[PDB]
Design a protein around this ligand. Structure first.
Ligand SMILES: O=C(Nc1ccccn1)Nc1cccc2c1[C@H]1CCCN1C2=O
Length: 279
């Protein structure tokens, strides 16, 4: 719109292009997402009221000339760029633990309001100079291609997934921060499923009741044995490995909720360290 001066392209998701921009009427720098179904307008208005320290604030919604723009608060850097900048030494454990803890508080808040993210990835986790991290793009999937973070139930064709899909994605991110390598970098839906099966074991009715009756399950899937987590995420300690194994349970009903994960022994010594970032 005319009240906004675009400074540059921040990025672009499936739902649209994002720009860093200046709001001439306030002078504030903002993240402007250019995306209209009445249903959408409604759902979005709801997201506007959801306020929490670990969620990127939706400042305003501009439905104009039959176009839809979302104006969000701007946050200094994304987690992916910080991970790449830290690949030689890795992110310090105390910061990994602070970031996971905060992300769980945000997810717990969202989940209590029945809002799922559905597409968590490093690119949409934003960090500031003060040690905080925030979830961006939450609620949009509902409102309106890396498969690395997708829960198995989505890959198997389940249409009514729950809050548990977000815990799965967070577990994959947790592992990636620790080892500095993506946990399941599949390049197609089937390759993704198979990379998951090769590490966690092909699922069956014992570990996942109902799995064989999922829309895309095939009796012909290969049968791989489960690997030990000590091999998958060294040097994560045993408390960290136990929390991770619970976030990665195959059955969505057995997967740990964001709320219960906040009381896990892993977080007993959390602190809030300030990162070493270059903007
Ligand atoms: O504030 C932001 N900063 C930033 C910095 C570097 C890279 C990306 N973003 N970004 C920001 C803020 C609100 C919403 C969105 C974003 C970007 C991140 C990926 C997709 N986008 C969104 O939908």
């Amino acid at each position: 719109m005319e009240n906004f001066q675009k400074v540059e392209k921040i990025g672009e998701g499936t739902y649209g292009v994002v720009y860093k921009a200046r709001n001439k009427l306030t002078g504030e720098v903002v993240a402007l997402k250019k995306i209209v179904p009445s249903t959408a307008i409604r759902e979005i208005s709801l997201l506007k009221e959801l306020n929490h320290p670990n969620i990127v604030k939706l400042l305003d919604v501009i439905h104009t000339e039959n176009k839809l723009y979302l104006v969000f608060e701007h946050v200094h850097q994304d987690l992916k760029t910080f991970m790449d900048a830290s690949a030689l030494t890795g992110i310090p454990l105390p910061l990994i633990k602070s970031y996971l803890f905060q992300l769980l508080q945000g997810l717990a808040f969202c989940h209590s309001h029945r809002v799922l993210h559905r597409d968590l990835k490093p690119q949409n986790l934003l960090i500031n100079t003060e040690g905080a991290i925030k979830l961006a793009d939450f609620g949009l999937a509902r409102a309106f291609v890396t498969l690395w973070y997708r829960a198995p139930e989505i890959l198997l064709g389940c249409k009514y997934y729950s809050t548990a899909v977000d815990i799965w994605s967070l577990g994959c991110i947790f592992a990636e921060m620790v080892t500095r390598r993506a946990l399941f970098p599949g390049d197609s839906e089937i390759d993704q499923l198979f990379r998951i099966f090769r590490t966690l074991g092909t699922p069956d009715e014992v570990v996942w009741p109902g799995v064989t009756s999922m829309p895309d399950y095939k009796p012909s899937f290969p049968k791989w044995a489960r690997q030990d987590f000590s091999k998958v995420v060294p040097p994560l300690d045993e408390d960290g490995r136990s929390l991770l194994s619970q976030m990665l349970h195959y059955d969505p009903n057995k997967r740990i909720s964001a709320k219960a994960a906040l009381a896990h022994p892993f977080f007993q010594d959390v602190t809030k360290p300030v990162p070493h970032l270059r903007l």
